[PDB]
């Protein structure tokens, strides 16, 4: 028997740890889940179902239900694209577009582009964690409270708009080297913004955000460590690759992406590698010395990409190389990607060139629009 999962979403404020993901992998790999006699005695199982994108849960004595019965494959989007509110537009206007690129890579590596700038608040992937984190937060923390974090740019914009749609106040902390949209947009959206000229990278701002949180009593929502960030991308960004691949007819053989906190490619890789362990996750290591806005090297510290059981390859990519790839996707497809998207296109194009990749369809996850990166556009043309 099928019942609604919304009612049983207190498991989000009770299950801790990652042991529950063992349930996810088996349900996904099998393509079904066992009926629960007592839904409340199985917090791990219920959470796993929500995390893979179920809308319903299987209840009763001995039965099972398929992923489609559970609602992993439910179409959310109104054909007409009419939404009664922006927050509902983020929620139901999904998947973000998967576009097959005219870009040709060697060895029959076919490039598809998942365009995460089709998010309403930050025109970047960072929307998805920001709605998930703040949505759970609405359960516990009183309205009018200040919520805050460090950001390269995208999450601080996403946090600011979503915080304010949920009644909460927003503070974002940025390194001096971040883009102007990050420093400016939150203020347009009613947040306070603090910029540390000396902080060379976003992770380096963390101690400052923790100290001030201890002094001031604001809630530091902490995207690096906050498990909602990984869970958003499990039921959203990852799940969508799963569903679109099947419905699109794709011979999916891999994903390509970039790493900041590691939330989205950790979720894509894990979800996809549950369904089929061969699927590669080609990830980008920004080259040493260089700065690619939004992303970083793994060994500067990432939660999920380390601790979860994920097969992944790295490819080194310089900024100049990421910008070359912006330019060529823009000439091939006329779509203008952000620096971090070009870093993942490039990194896939290398493994493809190397001969390390099987023939078939790869989905690259493009985190934002190049329209927010005029300086790095200008510099890459000259
Ligand atoms: C460096 C860092 O931790 O940034 C996290 C977060 N950025 C995510 C991000 C990423 C990486 O996504 P995640 O690994 O954080 O899921 C890639 N590209 C762009 C343009 C991004 O904005 C932010 O905006 O604060």
From Swiss-Prot:
The modification N6-(pyridoxal phosphate)lysine is found at residue 126. Pathway: Amino-acid biosynthesis; L-cysteine biosynthesis; L-cysteine from L-serine: step 2/2. Optimum pH is 6.7 for O-acetylserine sulfhydrylase A activity and 8.1-8.8 for cystathionine beta-synthase activity. Optimum temperature is above 90 degrees Celsius for S-sulfo-L-cysteine synthase activity, 70-80 degrees Celsius for O-acetylserine sulfhydrylase A activity, and 80 degrees Celsius for both cystathionine beta-synthase and L-serine sulfhdrylase activities. Pyridoxal 5'-phosphate binds at residues 154, 260-264, 340. Homodimer. Cysteine synthase that can also catalyze the synthesis of S-sulfo-L-cysteine from thiosulfate and O(3)-acetyl-L-serine, as well as the sulfhydrylation of L-serine by sulfide. Belongs to the cysteine synthase/cystathionine beta-synthase family. This is Protein CysO. It comes from Aeropyrum pernix (strain ATCC 700893 / DSM 11879 / JCM 9820 / NBRC 100138 / K1). The lineage of its organism: Archaea, Thermoproteota, Thermoprotei, Desulfurococcales, Desulfurococcaceae. The gene is cysO.
């Amino acid at each position: 028997a099928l019942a609604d999962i919304s009612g049983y979403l207190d498991v989000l404020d009770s299950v801790r740890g990652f042991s529950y993901l063992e349930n996810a992998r088996e349900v996904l790999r099998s393509g079904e889940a066992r009926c629960l006699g007592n839904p409340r005695s199985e917090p791990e199982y219920v959470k796993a179902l929500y995390v893979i994108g179920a809308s319903r849960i299987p209840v009763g004595d001995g039965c099972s239900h398929t992923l489609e019965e559970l609602g992993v494959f439910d179409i959310s989007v109104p054909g007409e694209m009419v939404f009664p509110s922006p927050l509902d537009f983020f929620e139901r206007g999904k998947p973000t577009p998967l576009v097959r690129s005219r870009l040709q890579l060697p060895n029959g590596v076919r490039v598809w582009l998942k365009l995460e700038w089709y998010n309403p608040f930050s025109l970047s992937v960072a929307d998805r964690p920001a709605v998930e984190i703040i949505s759970r937060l609405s359960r516990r923390v009183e309205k009018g409270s200040l919520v805050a974090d460090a950001t390269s740019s995208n999450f601080g914009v996403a946090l600011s708009a979503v915080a304010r749609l949920y009644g909460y106040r927003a503070r974002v902390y940025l390194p001096g080297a971040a883009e102007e949209f990050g420093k400016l947009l939150p203020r347009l959206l009613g947040a306070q913004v603090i910029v540390d000229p000396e902080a060379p990278s976003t992770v380096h701002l963390l101690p400052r955000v923790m100290k001030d949180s201890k002094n001031e009593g604001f809630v530091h929502v902490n995207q690096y460590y906050n498990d909602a960030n990984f869970e958003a991308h499990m039921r959203g960004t990852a799940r969508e690759i799963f569903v679109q691949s099947r419905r699109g007819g794709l011979a999916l053989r891999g994903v390509a992406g970039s790493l900041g906190t590691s939330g989205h490619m950790s979720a894509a890789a894990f979800y996809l590698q549950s369904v089929d362990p061969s699927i590669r996750a080609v990830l980008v290591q920004p080259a040493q010395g260089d700065s690619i806005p939004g992303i970083a090297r793994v060994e500067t510290g990432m939660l999920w990409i380390n601790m979860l059981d994920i097969s992944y390859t790295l490819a080194e990519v310089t900024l100049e190389e990421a910008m070359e790839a912006v330019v060529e996707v823009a000439r091939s497809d006329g779509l203008v990607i952000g620096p971090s998207g070009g870093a993942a296109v490039k990194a896939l194009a290398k493994k493809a060139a190397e001969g390390d990749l099987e023939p078939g369809d790869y989905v690259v996850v493009v985190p934002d629009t190049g329209f927010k990166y005029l300086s790095l556009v200008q510099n890459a043309l000259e």
